[PDB]
Amino acid sequence: DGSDPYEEMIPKWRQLNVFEGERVERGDVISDGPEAPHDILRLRGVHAVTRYIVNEVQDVYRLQGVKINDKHIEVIVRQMLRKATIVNAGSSDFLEGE
């Protein structure tokens, strides 16, 4: 990637999907499987984890025949998106959840 390579280890129990280069961008899927919500936040952004959780939650409700507005899930998602982690110093903060 030009600089700072990302050394990742796969225990070989899961097949590696992308064989060639194809200029794999950030957030691309390396191997198939249900992704954790934490991974989407770190690489794809806040907006992506909001869209994933809303669709996943609303899929169960819509299947039963229940109508709930999407504003009521985004409000709860906002309450789970506090407590950032700091990777820089100079303002009385160093590697601590605040």
Partner: protein, 160 residues
């Protein structure tokens, strides 16, 4: 759903997005991109169908064509993703061992990682050098050396 055919409910023109155009052995094209998007445009900008297209797929009708509906727009093997050939010509096999990396079923296995994957480019006409070929576990190539295979063609890969 073992059927790999994709049905079209309404006569909407297919809109293929985020795809790689690779010339195949016929007028159709093979997509080498894992992530692909399909959309239908009938009379306005609103889409109707998305579906999902895996890598190594062959589209029945070209992008932007007004599909009449009720017919397949793209066909692909639902069990294996073919590995496309970047160079058209003879297949160059390197370090081909008989009795250990050969499994008779010509259709012969390439190599086994546990038993032992040489990488070589496809020859131009016979043995000319022009691409890295990776052979995972249980990978089999049914095309022998000198087959003079054209670009956009792939044999059975036999996933492990």
């Amino acid at each position: 759903a073992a059927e790999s055919s994709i049905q079209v409910k309404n006569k909407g023109s297919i809109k293929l997005s985020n795809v790689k155009s690779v010339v195949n052995s016929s007028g159709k094209l093979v997509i080498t991109s894992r992530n692909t998007e399909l959309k239908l445009i009938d009379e306005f900008g609103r889409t109707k169908e998305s579906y999902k297209v895996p890598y190594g797929a062959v589209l029945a009708k070209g992008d932007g064509e007004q599909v009449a509906g009720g017919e397949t727009v793209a066909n692909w093997d639902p069990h294996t993703m073919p590995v496309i050939t970047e160079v058209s010509g003879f297949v160059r096999f390197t370090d081909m061992i008989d009795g250990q990396t050969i499994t008779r079923q010509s259709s012969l296995v390439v190599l086994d990682s546990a038993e032992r994957r040489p990488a070589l480019k496809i020859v131009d006409a016979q043995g000319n050098d022009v691409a890295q070929y990776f052979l995972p576990g249980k990978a089999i190539v049914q095309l022998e050396d000198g087959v003079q295979i054209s670009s956009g063609d792939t044999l059975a890969r036999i996933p492990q």
